[model samples]
Target: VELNNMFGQIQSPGYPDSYPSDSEVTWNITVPDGFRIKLYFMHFNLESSYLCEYDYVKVETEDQVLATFCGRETTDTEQTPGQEVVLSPGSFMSITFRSDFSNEERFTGFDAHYMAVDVDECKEREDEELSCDHYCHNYIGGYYCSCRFGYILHTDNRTCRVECSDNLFTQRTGVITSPDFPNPYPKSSECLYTIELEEGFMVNLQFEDIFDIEDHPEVPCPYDYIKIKVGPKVLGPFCGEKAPEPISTQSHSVLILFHSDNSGENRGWRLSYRAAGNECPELQPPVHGKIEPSQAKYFFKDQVLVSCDTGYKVLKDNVEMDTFQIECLKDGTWSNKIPTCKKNE
Candidate 1:
């Protein structure tokens, strides 16, 4: 019989009763595509075998032998401790038993059940040994471990050990901090950090606070420090009480790593990141001829020197002054749109 469903059972030829001599019987099992089958034998009794000369039962799949039994004792079975077999690693499973005419005694044959279970690739091993660097994903018959943004999987296969080694991009603003923000960090540890921004934009990293160990006074930093990287450029291997200027990336991405040698411990730091791009557009001439302070472009808060070209002036206090002034606004627009330009005598 071809069994369908998550679970089912199988047995020797007749079961509970001796199997007929010189008989060959086989059963097929099937489950959903992405699952594995588990088989458990309730009782096993068949012809004992040196060669299985008189009677025996064979259990197997298309490519592998799940198990073979021809004995009456538990010790004679193939799976001792669990007394069960895993049939996943194969195709259709079949069991066959044959008895010889000379054997007069009748013995109970084997009876077993099977169940299909979903495969979780990311499931922890039975021994609970492997841990992922950032995340773990499950699959049909297996699972995999992976790192989040700005992190790479190390040779250990479960750690993000390198800085900016992996590609990580941001969809919006976010925050990052040490392993334990308020608590002291552990000894002999290392961590990598990274972020990506949109085109025509750069990443801004501002430290909320700093409290890493500073045993000695090194210009940059000695131990328990962090290395900041942006594309090919590198910044401080910084540590100690003093905070550095707000860090910004030239391109659209940034990487930071923290390493601590066995030593003193202190409060770590927290950093917030956001995208900042050119806030001012190219300079355009106000209506009428050319404008003064006309050449330079500045970001928010910068002044556009109050004046126009020698031949042109602003309405001003109805006065023909030397110049005019405008401010760069936060939204990348100019404050007064550059006052109207008028021709002078």
Candidate 2:
């Protein structure tokens, strides 16, 4: 092969015809000073004898031999894997073919091709990439990919995924995100994370990083979002990349369920979570009515319903609607003051 190009082939003298005895040939491959040269035998044949005395091939670089072979150590067809030669530390490869004086019982000698492709150092261990840590710098032959901030790369170094697939219970403070945050999230997936603090402590959460969930201006994030809770206290199924308000619980526990549809791709969201000092505030259900939830100490975002004694009624919001309700707010307060029951006029 020419010293200028990276790919080409080499063959023995008078190929397909019996090669002359006592013959030797050399092929040189060159690439930019920073690439790797890898070569493999496509086909191999020669008169076989003890210790390969009839014909043989050897690869060299940096004045050291990389490999040598003779006869048919590999399978007959090139489709099956064959032996290879690799030269390292820079772009220079030397390959040689030799035939001894006993070439009468002839067979087609060895055939080989080589390429000087760039090396992916990040792939050295399949642990990190062009893993520039900040960015994978893939030059003519130097390369790698995964992402910021801290989501680790896959074994192959080209992909990343969130690591919270297994169910977990938080005995203390912790953080959660899609397998690969800051990078586009995997589609058709779900992540369920629960935070539990000591019995009187509350849970507080807010985003540390954000990515859009792919939404229109009018119907932003209609399909994908983080659903806070389902027991009628639906804080959201938030969409797109917009960061939402902080979420708090009525008591010592909270559930965060994240769902992503199969169609969209974007950097997923990350939020911080912590245990707090205060428990949910005490609630006072007014006369002639009682709380529907009657759960938690008027916990944050907890729904409280006002149902009246027989014959009495809830203060109607509109002339037709008769239910009275209030919700726990982020600031340990009720949603617009608690509602009370009234005697029908």
Candidate 3:
């Protein structure tokens, strides 16, 4: 149970004439075991003029004097108009006071006094247990709790829920293809890709080059051109501006393929092509052809065939070359862009 506030007002008879020069009043309160009590009081504006005196202010518990406040003509010098006393639980206490003068005229305003008690104990409840609506970690005095990441406390102050959906991704092809290529020159170039991701979901882009060289005299035949574009924007017209001063004979071309598994925004890889000279063009139109996904491992040799739609024929066989090259005829026919094994007649 909580303590209630108690206060009252009192008036004194005429000073040195009507009531005795010594008057008194008594205040009483009860205390419980393992608890303490504190008291506070005020005497209006009595500290300004005639000094007030207290004959005796004593506290008694169970018919025994526990403490006392007594002095003669004790002027109110300090501003601490309050007192406190501790009592064992299950004990009854009372406060009695006497003043030197009780003249109504000298007393001025009614003497107003206020009292409050604070009790300390181990509080217990039987019907309900304390619980937190959000994630909580136990601490010294009580429990500390908060909403999880990406969530906030609800307006009702009792629930934790999602705050915003800004990080969510709406597309299926989580690829973040870029329009800019890093080091877009002769030796090598790079492109950037980005993608927004949704919770628990991922996206990635796969790359495949229709043309690639295997064995050549040069160390590696550089890719003639690189294409950069995300969605629909093209960012490349790169050329072999800084071609090697004197090309090396043993150099070969290197083509890299890029692929990613995590969402484009989360993970990605780059592709590069290296050749002998920097005399390659920056941008080139993509070769017109239909791209078909394949699972066959030997598609490069068995099924991977590039020819004119109808009027195409063979121009070369599986012969060593610099780069995979194919030529088409005006008759609408096509031939093997890369050399292949000649068919036995």
Candidate 4:
């Protein structure tokens, strides 16, 4: 078998010079496929002060060494090249030659000979180009793309925006008006009416064609009429009875009356409405009616107080008296998970 040169002249210490009394020199080579290696050493005349002694060399790997060379006198040792070992793809192949000898100063010459033959040629192929309908992202030998959210791919595989129609509500026509203050009932105008509601039954007034007569123009009303459903038999407009009065008007208020039921728990009510030409608004029910905790009473004499505990902050103060009517927040600490305490320390 033949081999290729894997390593060149590797200098060894204390070979031809006298400096250190004891030192060693070694050389290694990493062999590729289709190759066999051989080492040749020759001892030259040493300096007058040093003499070459016994020198030994060996090779090793996962398996036992294929050959070894050792000598004591100024002689030559040769290793019969073994059969070529077929190297597996991606396998790590290595050869090491170590020389140990005692010499204050001595001269030695070593030469490594090798040659190689091409058993086969590595084949190569051109990669195919990846294609997508629209946009594409090239990955490891592949490509992919997708339409963004709020949009979808159409039949042509092109991105298209997605839209939903606005929700529909009951339509009503009436003369919407802000009554004149001081004598509110005496004056009213015909205008469009619309109402938007909130989750908590809160009401907001947004008049389309009304404005403050003083600093602001007397444009349309900027509020909505939130109507609270009292019962199947009775329903009342939110805001005070004369609540829709103009800004110039004073002392105008709305009267909201909640019916009493014999149920044990307080029957809370809600109102939802939006202005004629304004966005939907959230509304909250009044804090007046209450029922006995144990017994069923439609309306109790005392009002319910609503407040939050510590670690649970509230947007507003307790509405009435003695009622747990506040939004709760998760306790920051795991040990203080209970919400009954005013504060979690």
Candidate 5:
């Protein structure tokens, strides 16, 4: 028999009268979640036997038996409910009554009463790995969890995570670090840090001091890690005491992903990043002229002065001048073509 009531009464074959022999019955009582089954027997009388093997009343759950009873009263060899109360660990309870084929004495079976009782989830969730991360509130039949200020509850509904998807770096130079630098980072978090610049620029990154993330002895970054993405190429899923080497990416945009699993006490890592614009082609001075402050390579905003020899003059576009100057533009091209050295005429 299955009983789904919040409160109920259970009685054996013939209650208040002698129960017949060769009889057996079992009752399964179920209560709602967040509730526990509470039971007690008003009368417990059965044929006494060793370990209640003959005629007995048994109280149990789906997994294990709670109590077994026989005889009219409690004794050294035989056991009875007496004034004791039985409580189910969860929301289910089972009662079984059994009588052998023959009985020497007439026995009135057992009478048991049960009811559902509210469970204090807030107080019961005592372990550090409890159902809630910050605060827990338990109601009559359920419970809810909440995070602290500035923190949001994760999809798991238990761990608290920080919001960092909006972290964008547009400047030419900047620094990126884990949450609470020099301090242990928050667990159960994934953060994305992006560095975006103009098409003609390239990004460079350098990891700095106290670089620590969760790691393994032989496995590669099995736990918390940091990954770098630049265009279609992926750099690493790096972790450990040693930080990643400096990276110079070809793409103008770079994305950094920091992932932390649900555990670890290690302090996170940090990186300094800067952007460098494209380099212009080298320029050579014309015959009879020389280029001043010339270098092997020229980048954006680099200026060079072109001058002629003593007997010659700088000429560009059919014009003559003492000196000509040109600048390297962001497009990796010189602002003006190199001038020629013409004869003084």
Candidate 6:
């Protein structure tokens, strides 16, 4: 017999009357998820036997036996269900009854009742690794997980992650930090931060403050970590309490990614980045003319002034001038070539 109702009763063949010889019956009780089966016996009587091998009513799950009953309520060797209740660990249970060839004494068999009990999932999943990251709610036949005020529920529906993939840094110097910096970082999240600059510029980075991420003693960054990508090279997937050393990347753009798993309570990290312009070739003064504040390796935006001696004049592009000005450009080159000094004609 198959049983799927919330509550029901079961009895052996000819209950309250002597059971027929050579009889066997089995009942399979299955409930929905988030429920457990509860069973109890009101009356029990069977032929007395050692270990109840001759005749018995067995209650168990698909994998293990829960109880076996035979003979009277109190027996020397055989076990019988008296006032004790049987509770299943999960949703399914099996009950079997068997009787052999003959019975010397009259036996009325067994009568039992079963009901489906609600299981509180929220209370059972209290471990930090298994429980919801934020709030958990339990209903009659199921449960749900929810996040905090500013957090969003992860796709797995258990972890609360933040939206952090849209950070862009273009300034010459700035600071960026993990969400909830001095506090514990959110779980199961990935953040992508990018720093972009024009050509002939390089990016420099320095980590600061507490840099703590979930890590293993034997493995490198097995859980949560931070990684950097600059130019053709990829930096560390760094973790642990110790911060990384200062880094200077000779590239115009940099990419940073920080990832977190579903566990750990470690506080995150912070970093400050600055950009440096490329160096241009050295400039020289023309004959009969002198360059003001002559410097080696001029950088982007640096300016130079060229002036001629006493009776001479500066000439560039066939134009005469008292002084000519040149500027270093972002492409590691000067705005114009140095002018020549010519006699006043």
Best by TM-score: 6
- As for TM-score, the candidate ahead, 1 or 6, is 6
143-181: candidate 4 lDDT, tens digit per residue: 334554544444433222222223232322222333322
**In model 6, where do residues sit more than 4 Å from their true spots?**
71-78, 126-131, 169-173, 196-202, 215-223, 231-233, 250-253, 262-266, 274-345
Candidate that scores best on lDDT:
6
**RMSD (CA, angstroms), candidate 4:** 29.5
Cα deviation at 245, candidate 5, in Å, is 2.1
Q: Tell me model 4's lDDT, rounded to 2 decimals.
A: 0.30
Off by over 4 Å in 5: 74-78, 101-109, 118-134, 140-142, 170-173, 181-190, 197-203, 214-224, 248-253, 260-266, 274-345
RMSD of 6: 6.5
Residue runs of model 2 more than 4 Å from their true location after superposition = 73-90, 125-133, 143-345
- Candidate 3 regions off by >4 Å? 1-7, 10-69, 72-112, 115-345
State the lDDT at 84 in candidate 3.
38
lDDT of each: 0.66, 0.65, 0.33, 0.30, 0.86, 0.88
Candidate 3 local lDDT, 238-304, one digit each (tens): 2222222211222121112222111111111232222211121112212432212223222111223
TM for every model, in the order presented, reads: 0.39, 0.37, 0.23, 0.21, 0.67, 0.69
Query: TM-score: which is higher, 4 or 5?
Result: 5
Worst 10 residues of 1 by lDDT: 73-82
Superior by lDDT: candidate 1 or candidate 5: 5
Q: List the residue pairs that clash in candidate 5.
A: none
TM-score of candidate 4 against the unseen true structure: 0.21
How large is the C-alpha RMSD of every model relative to the true structure? 14.5, 15.2, 20.7, 29.5, 6.5, 6.5
What lDDT is reached at residue 204 by model 6? 90
Q: What is the lDDT of residue 319 in candidate 6?
A: 82
Candidate order (TM-score): 6, 5, 1, 2, 3, 4
Single out the weakest 10-residue window by summed lDDT for candidate 2: 72-81
Candidate 3 residue 300 Cα shift, in angstroms, is 16
Instruction: Encode model 1's per-residue lDDT on 223-333: one tens digit a residue.
Output: 678788887878877777766678876556778887865445477777787767566777776665454455566665557655555677776656665557777665677
Which 10-residue window of candidate 4 scores lowest in summed lDDT?
A: 183-192
